[PDB]
C-alpha cells in the first residue's frame, strides 16, 4: 500500500494482514 | 457555541479583583502621598496620617 | 421584449453563438412556491394545512364516544407589517383561525349525537409569513430557511463487500426508510444467513418476523423455495423433472428415462442434454434412494395410523427417514429446490437458526428485543409489534416513500398505503434473495434519485403536524370526562403546544439562519440552497468522501463547482439554473425532445431516474437549418457515461450551454478556461463582495447579471409601466398607462425607495432613482437601483486598469499593490451602518439613570450629549465619545486612607452612582444617522422620547398626506378625462372647484358607470387615509413591551466610512486573491507611452501554478472593450455627429460573423442613440456567455477595432527612472472585488484587560479583545527551542496566575524585568477538584 | 454521592429544569482530551495580538512590521514606566492619560522601548519549531503585520489573508531566550534536514534567473571589462544587455589556505548579469557558483555553501541581499504573462488523429470478438495515455528551444525567453506537469468511483472546455479539496502521537 | 508501537493529561504514586521550568540539592 496512512502503520508496529514467517 | 468546550461559566468576568494596570496606581499613589507629606513638619504630617 | 426602456439605455454586447431556447427562470422558485404550497387551500390530502389537519383528525376521546372533527381554517391579516416587525422585534407573522365540530355520542349507541356545538374559528397559534422575496423575519432580522437534502424514505439495496470480515465473498443487505416510524433492517451474513434487525438493535435471525406475521414454518418454505416432487410409483422412489432444474450441476447418477439414456453418471448438464428432454418431453425419471439424504422436506409428514410426526417441516431426510414414512404409505415427498449457484438454500439455514416456533413465541422474541429486561405479556408484544409498522399514527411512508417503495420493487400501483402489509415484508426479501442469487442490482446512495428535497413548505407542515398530535391527547384527554355542554372546543384546544413546534423551528433551527446579506448574489445564492445537514440529515464528522463527492447525476440539477471549501465540502452545494423539484420532490432538469434526425424545442424536465435510460446530447452541438445535427455522430451522454453517439439516435438534448452551473458560476467570465479549483474558489469568493460607493458595472460580463439583479429583491422594478410622474430621491411615482389600468380608482404607483439603513452584514442597503423626470418606462423595467446594481446589471465591484508584473516584491505572493488614484477617487470605499446599544436596568441598588450627569467627565465629553443625554443626530463622532450617558446605583465604596486624603485636599463628593454610559468602540468613528428609544410601558418619556415621537408622528402624517394628495390628483386627472368624453367642457370644468366635480352626471352610457366607480374608491381613500393615520398614530405612542428588568433601552445607529487600506482582502471572479500590500503614489505607477498610469499592479506568477487561464483573457478582452469606449469618448468629444457614431457603434455589435445580439436602426436615429453612446464612453460592456462566450479571434479582433495590439501586451515605463520595461507586459481591465475581511476588523490587541472569575484568565469584556489564545503546538514550538522561560511566562504570569500578574506589572514599570511566578490558579483549582473527592493530594518536601 | 462525584455511572441525575444532565466533579477534570487546561487550548495569554499579514520586501530578515496602534497597547507598561522614569510624566495617572491622549511626545518613548526588544510572530498551523520566530519591530503606520518575504516559507504563509499573532517577551530572559534561540536570524535551517529554508521563493529567484541568462547576441558581445563595477555601469546606463556573453576580470578568494583567504585573479569569461550578481557574492566564494543560469535549485546550494563556508553571518547578510536584489532585477526585466506566451504545438491537431485511429482499430478489434472486453479496454487506455506523453514531449520541445536568433551568421538556438518558460525552468512557479494542462492537453480524467475515462480532455485551457469535459474535471477536483481537508487535520495527529511517545 | 508505547509514563501528571483521567487518578492513587515532575508535560501543567533548554540550568542544579546532604 502506501501513504501518510502507511507511516502511522509502520510506527505503530501493526503486524500486516497476511504476513511472511521467518 | 460552536459545541466547543465555550461553557456559560467561562464567559463570567471577575468584577471583585482589581485589575492590575489600576494596582500599580495604588502603590503609585502612597509614593505620592509620602512624598506630599514630607512637605510638612513633622506635626503636621503626624497629624494629617493620624486623621 | 425585442428591448426595453432601460436596455435603450445601455445594451451589453454579447458574445456567443448558440441561441437560447430556455430563459432564466425565477431564480427565488424554490423558497416562494414551497411555502405557497404550505399554507393554502387545498380541497384534498395534497401537502397543505389541510393535508396535517385530516391527518390528526378527528379526534374521539376514550371509548368515551367524545369526537372533535375539524371544519375549516383560515390565516388572519398580520398584527404588523414587515417594516414595522423589523424595528419593534417581533416576528412577522398571522393568525391560524380554524373552525372546530364538537360531537358526543349518546353511550350505548346507534351512533347518533346528544348535543354538537360549533365553536366558531378556535385561534391556535401565529404562523410566520414569507417576504415577497423569500424571507422570514424571526425577530427583527431577516432570516432563510434552506432546503434541505436526505435519504428518500423507501427500500434500499446495498453492498458491503470488502471491509467486513476481510474474507471477501461481499455481502448484502436490504433497508427499508419510512418517513416516519421504525427502520426495519435485512442483512446477510458469511454464514448466508439472513438476519434482520428493529432499527440499530440486535441482530435477529430474519424469519422471526414471518411467524409474527402469522405463517407457519410449512408456509416459509413454499414462499421462497420451489418444489421438487418426489414420487413413490409402483415401488424405489420416481421424481418429477423440470428440465431446467439440470443446469449447473453435474449428474449424481444415471439420468434416464422412457427406455432412453438421456445423461449418465459422471456427465455433466450442458445446454446440449438440457435441450434433448425439453424437446423429449421427459416428466418422469427413476431416482435412487440415497439421492434425498440431503433434500430438505418441504411440509410436514405424519404417520397416517399412529398420528405421530414422522419428520418436521425442514428436516434433512435420511435414507432410514424415507423407510419410516415409506411404509406408512406415503406417496409423494415434498422437498426444497436448492442450487448452490442460481437459487440459494438461504431461508431454509435461516430456520435452523431460529429459536422461536410460533406467532406468539416470535412476538415474545420481538417485544423482549426492543424493549428488554421488562417480563412480555402477550397483549404488550402484540399492541407493540402492531404499533411499529402497522400502525396508522407510528408509521407513515408518506406519499414519497410508498411510491419509492412500490417503484424499487417492480409493482404496478405507484401510489398506496401508508403502513406496511405482509405482502410488502415478503417482497423485500425475496428481492435481497433476488441479488443474492445473481438477478438484480443494488442501488447506491449518492444517487439523486434516492436523494430528496426538502423546503420550508414541507417542514413546517411536520412541524404543525407534530402540535396537533400534542395537543390530541389533551383533546381525547379532556373529552373523557367532560361534562355534555358545558366545555367546548375552546377550552380544549390550546394554544402555547401548537404556537411553539412552528416557532421553535423557525426560531433556532439548524436550517434557519440569517440571510448572508452583504450581496444580492448572497442574498440569492443563500436562498437557493441545498444542504444534507441539521435535523434528519448527516454531520460532518459522520459521513465520508462517497456523499461528498459528486456524482454523474448531479447533471443539471445540482452545481459541481459551486460547494464551499472547508469542513463540509459537498455537503452543501447550490442549486443549478435550471432545476426544478419534481412532482414527488426529486431534482429534475430541462430537456429538448429530439424525434427522428430533428432538435424539437419542446422542452421536457427529466428526474434523476427519469433521465437514466434516454440518450441525451450536448449543450454544444452543431445543427443547423431545420436543426438537424451537422455531424454523422455527436458526443452524448447515455447511461452514466459519455462517448461519441451516432447522428440519429439522440432521445433528447440539453437546453441551455449553462444548465450545468450555479447562478454563482454562470456570472464568472470565460469560465470555461480556468481549473475547477479555483472556480469553486472564485464562485465562493464571489459571495463576499461587500458593495461599494459607487456602483460601477462589469466591464467582462456573463449576461447572467441582469438576472440576478432583478430577481433578487434588492432593486424595485415597474409593477405596471407608464410615464413617470415624480421623481424624488425619496420616492417615485409612475402614472399608469390606462391599457395596463384598472377601471375603478384610475390610480398611479408610487413606490417607496429604501433609504440609508442597516443590513444583516452591517453593510450599507440604499436604493437610488435610475430614471429621469418624465421618461417613459414599460413594465417590468428597472426604476431604482439597489446597493451593487447599475442601471440593473449586478456590479459587486469596480473594474479597473490592471498591469501584470512583479514590482519589486510588493506583489510577492498574492499581495496587491494599488495606485493612490484608487483611493483617491473613493472607489473602492465602502459604508458600514452599526447598531449599537444602551440598556438601563433594574438592579436591587436601584434603577439605573439614562441621565446626562455622569460622574467626572469635562465640558468637552457632554457636549455631543443634548440635554436628556444621548448624542444629537448628525454630530460626527469618533473612538470614545459618549453615545448614551448611562450610570447605575452602587452605594458606599468603602475607599482607603490614601484616597481619602485626596477627596479632603481636593473636596469632591464622591458619587453614589457608577458610570456604565454607552461609548464608542476603540478606533472606530463615523456619524450618527438615526436614533431610536424604547421605554417600558409606564415609565415616563423623557424629554428626547418625546421629542423624537412628536417627530415621527409629525412625518408620518406627512407620508400620508403626501400619498392622498398624490392619490386624489391622479384620480381627479382621470375623472376629468371621462367627464371630456360624452359631455365634453374642456375650459369650463376646471374652473369650478375639484371638490364639486362629483355632481355631474352624463348621457346613459358606461362612463356614467365609470364616474360612479371613481366615486366609491375616491370616498373609500378618504377614509383608508383616516383609518392608516389613526393606526399609526397608536402605534407609534404605545409602550414598547420590553424584557424583565430592562426600563429603557436607546439604539444608536453610526455610519462609518472605511475606504481601503494594506490588509484588505481583494479578488477576482476568478479565484484568485489578494491582500493589499502597499498604497502607492500615482507618481511611481508604471504608466504607458500616453502618460496614463496604471491602477492595479498583480504578480504574474500565480497565473501559471494556480491554473485559471480566464483571468487572463478577462484583462485582455476588457482592454479591447475599453478601448471600443475610448474610442467613443473620442468622438463624442469631437462631436462628430449622429451617424459617425451611429456607423461605428453598428461596427461593434455585428464583430465580423455569426453571433447572436442582432441590433439598431430600429432606435431612435436622435434622443436614443447620443443617450446610448454616452453610457458607452466609460467602456464598452460585454457579455461573455459561459461556455457560449467569445473567443480569441473575436477577442483580437475586437482589439483591431480598438487600436490596441493583438498580443494584449504593451510597453510600460516606472515612474521612478522613467526608464523602460524590458519585455512588453499585460495590460488591461480587470473586474476586481473587496471582500469583506478588512484589516479594521480582524486587528486586535491586548496588553491586560479583564478576566474570568472561575478561572482567572483573559476574557475580553469591554470588546477590548481576549488575549490569543496559546496552544499545545505553541507550547512544543517553545519545547524545541530551549525557550523554557518565555514558556513559563507564558502559562503563569501572563495568564493563569493572579499573583504573578500583578506582581509582575509592577516590575514592567518599576524597570526591572523578571518574574516572581508561582502557581497557575488552574493547576491550584484542579488540587481542590482532585481533593474534593475522596483523593488526599499532597505537595511534599522542600 | 456517585452522581456527585463521578456522574454517569449509574443514572445520569438530570439537572434542575434542564434536561441535560449535570456535570459532576470528575466530569470537571475530565474533557477532551484529558484535561481542558493544558490541551490545546490552552489558556488565553496577555500582552498579546494578532491581525492580517502583508509583504514588506524592504524588512532586513531580522526584522518584522508592526502596526502603530498594535505596539501601543502591547507595550503599554513598558510605555507608562519609561515616561516616568525620564520624567515626562508626574504619575503613572498622568501617564496614562498622556498615551491616551496619544501625545506625540509618546511615539518617541515607544520607539525607545522598541528598540532592542524583540517580539515573537506565530502562525495557525504551528508544526516545527520554526512555526514561532522573533523578529525585532519596525513601527509601521497601518493596522497589517508585515513578514519578511523569505520567511514566508517556514511558516508555510500565503499573502491571501492569512493571520499571524504578536507576542512580548516580558521578562528578561524571554527577551535573550528570544534573541539567542527564536530570532529570526538563528534559525536559518530546517531541523528536517539541514538545507536551508529560508531558499529564495518566486519572484526573487525570477530575478536571479533573468539576470543571470544568456542570450546568442545582445548589446556589448564580445567586449571586456576590468570588473563587476564597469559591468553595472555599462548596464544601467544602457549601454550593454543584461545577458550578453562577455569576458570581464573578477577577483575571486579561496579560503583554502590554513583558515586564510588565498586570491586569485582572472578573465573570466561569463555574462553581463553574473558579473553584476557577483558584488553581492561574499569573499570565500568562487565565482564557479554565479557563473551558471542560477535557477531555484541552485540558487540554494548557493546559500548553503556560503554557510558551510563562511559561516553565519556572512550568509544571513548575503541571503538579505539577494533578495532585495532579485525582487528588483526581477521588476525591471518585466516579465509578464499573455494569452499569446502559451504555445499550442502546430502538431497536436495531428497527433490526437493518429491516436483517435488506434481507438477505432481496437474497437473494430472487439467487434469482431477479436479481443476481449478488458484488453480491448486496456489498450484504449494506453494509446491515449502515449498520446498525452507525445503531445507533451511535443509542445515541451517548441515552447523550450524555439527562440532561432542570429549572431553575425544566418541561425542558432537556445533556451527560449518566453514569459512562462521562465517561469517554470528557474524553479520560481510552474512545473511541466502544469504547463502541460496549459498547452498540451491535459491528462484522462477519472470517474469517482476511481476508474479512468477512456476519452480524455483533448483540450486545454488556452483552447475552451466544453460542458463535459469540464464536468469530468470536477472529481479531480472534488477530490482534491476533500482530501486536503480531512487530510490537514490527520497530519496533526501523528504528530500528536510522536511528541507524546518522545 | 508509538501509541502503545507512550501509554507508559512514570509521572502520573503527565498520564492524567493525555490518558484517560479517570482510571490514571484511581490506579495511581491506591498505589501512593508520588510524582517527582521530572518531565515537560508535567512541569508545564504545574506552571514551572521545563526540565530541558533554559530550564535544563535549573533542574539540574535541583536535582543534586535533592536526595542529598
Ligand atoms: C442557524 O444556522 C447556523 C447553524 C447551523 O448548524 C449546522 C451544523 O447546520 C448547518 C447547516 C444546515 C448549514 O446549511 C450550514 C452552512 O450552510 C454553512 C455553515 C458554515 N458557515 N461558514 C461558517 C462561517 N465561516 C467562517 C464561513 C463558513 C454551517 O456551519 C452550516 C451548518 C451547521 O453548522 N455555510 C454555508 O452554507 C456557506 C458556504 C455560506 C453561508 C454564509 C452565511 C454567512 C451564513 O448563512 C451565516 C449567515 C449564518 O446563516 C450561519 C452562520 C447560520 O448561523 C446563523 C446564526 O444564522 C448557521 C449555519
Ligand atoms: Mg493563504
Known sequence: TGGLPRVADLFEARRPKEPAIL | GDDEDSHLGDFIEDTTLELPLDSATTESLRAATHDVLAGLTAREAKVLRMR | ?????????????????????????????????????????????????????????????????????????????????????????????????????????????????????????????????????????????????VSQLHRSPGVFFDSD??????????????????????????????????????????????????????????????????????????????????????????????????????????????????????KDDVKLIEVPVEYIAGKVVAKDYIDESTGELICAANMELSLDLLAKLSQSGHKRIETLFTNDLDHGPYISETLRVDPTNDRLSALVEIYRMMRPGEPPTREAAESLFENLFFSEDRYDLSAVGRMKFNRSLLREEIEGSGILSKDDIIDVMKKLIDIRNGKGEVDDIDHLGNRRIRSVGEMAENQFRVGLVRVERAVKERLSLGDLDTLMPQDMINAKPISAAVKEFFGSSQLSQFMDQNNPLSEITHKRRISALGPGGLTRERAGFEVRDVHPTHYGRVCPIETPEGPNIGLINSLSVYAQTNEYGFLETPYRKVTDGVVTDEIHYLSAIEEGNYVIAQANSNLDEEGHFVEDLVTCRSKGESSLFSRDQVDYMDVSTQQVVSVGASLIPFLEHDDANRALMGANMQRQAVPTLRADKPLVG???????????????????GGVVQYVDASRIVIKVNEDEMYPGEAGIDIYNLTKYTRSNQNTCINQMPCVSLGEPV????????????????????????????????????????????????????????????????????????????????????????????????????????????????????????????????????????????????????????????????????????????????????????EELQILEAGLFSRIRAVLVAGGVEAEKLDKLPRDRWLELGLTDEEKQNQLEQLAEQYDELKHEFEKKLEAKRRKITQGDDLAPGVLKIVKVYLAVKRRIQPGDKMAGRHGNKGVISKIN?????????????????????????????????????????????????????????????????????????????????????????????????????????????????????????????????????????????????????????????????????????????????????????????????????????????????????????????????????????????????????????????????????? | VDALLDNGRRGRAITGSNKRPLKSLADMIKGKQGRFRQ???????????????????????????????????????????????????????????????????????????????????????????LGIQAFEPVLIEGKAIQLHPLVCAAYNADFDGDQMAVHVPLTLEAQLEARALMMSTNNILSP???????????????????????????????????????????????????????????????????????????????????????????????????????????????????????????????????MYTGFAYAARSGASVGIDDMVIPEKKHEIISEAEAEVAEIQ????????????????????????????????????????????????????????????????????????????????????????????????????????????????????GLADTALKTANSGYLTRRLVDVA | GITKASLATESFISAASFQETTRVLTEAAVAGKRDELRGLKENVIVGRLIPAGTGYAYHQDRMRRRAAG
Not at chain 3, 81 to 86: A, F, G, I, K, R
Not at chain 3, 711 to 719: E, I, L, R, Y
Not at chain 3, 1288 to 1309: A, F, H
Open chain 3, 161 to 278: 463487500k470488502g471491509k467486513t470480515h476481510s474474507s471477501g465473498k461481499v455481502l448484502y443487505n436490504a433497508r427499508i426508510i419510512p418517513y416516519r416510524g421504525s427502520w426495519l433492517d435485512f442483512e446477510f451474513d458469511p454464514k448466508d444467513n439472513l438476519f434482520v434487525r428493529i432499527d440499530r438493535r440486535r441482530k435477529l435471525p430474519a424469519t422471526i418476523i414471518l411467524r409474527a406475521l402469522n405463517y407457519t414454518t410449512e408456509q416459509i418454505l413454499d414462499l421462497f423455495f420451489e418444489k421438487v416432487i418426489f414420487e413413490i410409483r409402483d415401488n424405489k422412489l420416481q421424481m418429477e423433472l423440470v428440465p431446467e432444474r439440470l443446469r449447473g450441476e453435474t449428474a449424481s447418477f444415471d439420468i434416464e428415462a422412457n427406455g432412453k439414456v438421456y445423461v449418465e453418471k459422471g456427465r455433466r448438464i450442458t445446454a446440449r442434454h438440457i435441450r434433448q428432454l425439453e
Open chain 3, 1 to 145: 421584449m425585442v428591448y426595453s426602456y432601460t436596455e435603450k439605455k445601455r445594451i451589453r454586447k454579447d458574445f456567443g453563438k448558440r441561441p437560447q431556447v430556455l430563459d432564466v427562470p425565477y431564480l427565488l422558485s424554490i423558497q416562494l412556491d414551497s411555502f405557497q404550497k404550505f399554507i393554502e387551500q387545498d380541497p384534498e390530502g395534497q401537502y397543505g394545512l389541510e393535508a396535517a389537519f385530516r391527518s390528526v383528525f378527528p379526534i374521539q376521546s376514550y371509548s368515551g364516544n367524545s369526537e372533535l372533527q375539524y371544519v375549516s381554517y383560515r390565516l388572519g391579516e398580520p398584527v404588523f407589517d414587515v417594516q414595522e416587525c423589523q424595528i419593534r422585534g417581533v416576528t412577522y407573522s398571522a393568525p391560524l383561525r380554524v373552525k372546530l365540530r364538537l360531537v358526543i355520542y349518546e353511550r350505548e349507541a346507534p351512533e347518533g349525537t346528544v348535543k354538537d356545538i360549533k365553536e366558531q374559528e378556535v385561534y391556535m397559534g401565529e404562523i410566520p409569513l414569507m417576504t415577497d422575496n423569500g424571507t422570514f423575519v424571526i425577530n427583527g432580522t431577516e432570516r432563510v430557511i
Open chain 3, 778 to 961: 414599460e413594465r417590468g423595467d428597472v426604476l431604482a437601483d439597489g446597493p451593487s446594481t447599475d442601471l440593473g446589471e449586478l456590479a459587486l465591484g469596480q473594474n479597473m486598469r490592471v498591469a501584470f508584473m512583479p514590482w519589486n516584491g510588493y506583489n510577492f505572493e498574492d499581495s496587491i499593490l494599488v495606485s493612490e488614484r484608487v483611493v483617491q477617487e473613493d472607489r473602492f470605499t465602502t459604508i458600514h451602518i452599526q447598531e449599537l446599544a444602551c440598556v438601563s436596568r433594574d438592579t436591587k441598588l436601584g434603577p439605573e439613570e439614562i441621565t446626562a450627569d455622569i460622574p467626572n467627565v469635562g465640558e468637552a465629553a457632554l457636549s455631543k450629549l443634548d440635554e436628556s443625554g444621548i448624542v444629537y443626530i448628525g454630530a460626527e463622532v469618533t473612538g470614545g465619545d459618549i453615545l448614551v450617558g448611562k450610570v447605575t446605583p452602587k452605594g458606599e465604596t468603602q475607599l482607603t486612607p490614601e484616597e481619602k486624603l485626596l477627596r479632603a485636599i481636593f473636596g469632591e463628593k464622591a458619587s453614589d452612582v457608577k458610570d456604565s454610559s454607552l461609548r464608542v468602540p476603540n478606533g472606530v468613528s463615523g456619524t450618527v444617522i438615526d436614533v431610536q428609544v424604547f421605554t417600558r410601558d409606564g415609565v415616563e418619556k423623557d424629554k428626547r422620547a418625546l421629542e423624537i415621537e412628536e417627530m415621527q408622528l409629525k412625518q408620518a402624517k406627512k407620508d400620508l398626506s
Open chain 4, 192 to 322: 528536517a534536514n539541514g538545507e536551508p529554508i529560508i531558499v529564495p521563493s518566486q519572484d526573487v529567484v525570477l530575478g536571479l534567473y533573468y539576470m543571470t541568462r544568456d542570450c546568442v547576441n545582445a548589446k556589448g558581445e564580445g567586449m571586456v571589462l576590468t570588473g563587476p563595477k564597469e559591468a553595472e555601469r555599462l548596464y544601467r546606463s544602457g549601454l550593454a544587455s543584461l545577458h550578453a556573453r562577455v569576458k570581464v576580470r573578477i577577483t575571486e578568494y579561496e579560503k583554502d589556505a590554513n583558515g586564510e583567504l588565498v586570491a586569485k585573479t582572472s578573465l573570466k569569461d561569463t555574462t553581463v548579469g553574473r558579473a553584476i550578481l557577483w558584488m553581492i557574492v561574499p569573499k570565500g566564494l568562487p565565482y564557479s557558483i554565479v557563473n551558471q543560469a542560477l535557477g531555484k535549485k541552485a540558487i540554494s546550494k548557493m546559500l548553503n555553501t556560503c554557510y558551510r563556508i563562511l559561516g553565519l553571518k556572512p550568509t544571513v547578510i548575503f541571503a538579505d541581499q539577494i
Open chain 3, 702 to 720: 456573463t449576461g447572467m447579471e441582469r438576472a440576478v439583479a432583478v430577481d433578487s429583491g434588492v432593486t424595485a422594478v415597474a409593477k405596471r
Open chain 3, 1081 to 1342: 503614489p500615482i507618481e511611481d505607477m508604471p504608466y504607458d507611452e500616453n502618460g496614463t498610469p496604471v491602477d492595479i499592479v498583480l504578480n504574474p506568477l500565480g497565473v501559471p501554478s494556480r491554473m485559471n487561464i480566464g483571468q487572463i483573457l478577462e484583462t485582455h478582452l476588457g482592454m479591447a472593450a475599453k478601448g471600443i469606449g475610448d474610442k467613443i469618448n473620442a468622438m463624442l468629444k469631437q462631436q462628430q455627429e449622429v451617424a459617425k457614431l451611429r456607423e461605428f457603434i453598428q461596427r461593434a455589435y455585428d464583430l465580423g460573423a455569426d453571433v447572436r445580439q442582432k441590433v439598431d436602426l430600429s432606435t431612435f436615429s436622435d434622443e436614443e442613440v447620443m443617450r446610448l453612446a454616452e453610457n458607452l464612453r466609460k467602456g464598452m460592456p460585454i457579455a461573455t456567455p459561459v461556455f457560449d462566450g467569445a473567443k480569441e479571434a473575436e477577442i483580437k479582433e475586437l482589439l483591431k477595432l480598438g487600436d490596441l495590439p493583438t498580443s494584449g501586451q504593451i510597453r510600460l515605463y516606472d515612474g521612478r527612472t522613467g526608464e523602460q520595461f524590458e519585455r512588453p507586459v499585460t495590460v488591461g481591465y480587470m473586474y476586481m472585488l473587496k471582500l469583506n475581511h478588512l484589516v479594521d476588523d480582524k486587528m486586535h490587541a491586548r496588553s491586560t484587560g479583564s478576566y474570568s472569575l472561575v478561572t482567572q484568565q483573559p476574557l475580553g469584556g469591554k470588546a477590548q479583545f481576549g488575549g490569543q489564545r496559546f496552544g499545545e503546538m505553541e507550547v512544543w514550538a517553545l519545547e524545541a527551542y530551549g525557550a523554557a522561560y518565555t514558556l513559563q511566562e507564558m502559562l503563569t504570569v501572563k495568564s493563569d496566575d493572579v499573583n504573578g500578574r500583578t506582581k509582575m506589572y509592577k516590575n514592567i514599570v518599576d524597570g526591572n524585568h523578571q518574574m516572581e511566578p508561582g502557581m497557575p490558579e488552574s493547576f491550584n483549582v484542579l488540587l481542590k477538584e482532585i481533593r474534593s473527592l475522596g483523593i488526599n493530594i499532597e505537595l511534599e518536601d522542600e
Open chain 4, 39 to 129: 490541551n490545546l487550548l490552552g489558556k488565553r495569554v496577555d500582552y498579546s495580538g494578532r491581525s492580517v499579514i502583508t509583504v514588506g520586501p524592504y524588512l532586513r530578515l531580522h526584522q518584522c512590521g508592526l502596526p502603530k496602534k498594535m505596539a501601543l497597547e502591547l507595550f503599554k507598561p513598558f510605555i507608562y514606566g519609561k515616561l516616568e522614569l525620564r520624567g515626562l510624566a508626574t504619575t503613572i495617572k498622568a501617564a496614562k492619560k498622556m498615551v491616551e491622549r496619544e501625545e506625540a511626545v509618546v511615539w518617541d518613548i515607544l520607539d525607545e522601548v522598541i528598540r532592542e526588544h524583540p517580539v515573537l510572530l506565530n502562525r495557525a498551523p504551528t508544526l516545527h519549531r
Open chain 4, 364 to 479: 473494430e478489434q472487439f467487434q469482431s470478438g477479436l479481443v476481449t472486453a478488458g484488453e480491448r479496454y486496456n489498450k484504449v487506455i494506453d494509446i491515449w495515455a502515449a498520446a498525452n506523453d507525445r503531445v507533451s514531449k511535443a509542445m515541451m520541445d517548441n515552447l523550450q528551444t524555439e527562440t532561432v536568433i542570429n549572431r553575425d551568421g544566418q541561425e542558432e538556438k537556445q533556451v527560449s525567453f518566453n514569459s512562462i518558460y521562465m517561469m517554470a525552468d528557474s524553479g520560481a512557479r510552474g512545473s511541466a506537469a502544469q504547463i502541460r494542462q496549459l498547452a498540451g492537453m491535459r491528462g484522462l480524467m477519472a470517474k469517482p468511483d476511481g476508474s479512468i475515462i477512456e476519452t480524455p480532455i483533448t483540450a486545454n485551457f488556452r483552447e475552451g472546455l466544453n460542458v463535459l469535459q469540464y464536468f469530468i474535471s470536477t472529481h479531480g477536483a472534488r477530490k
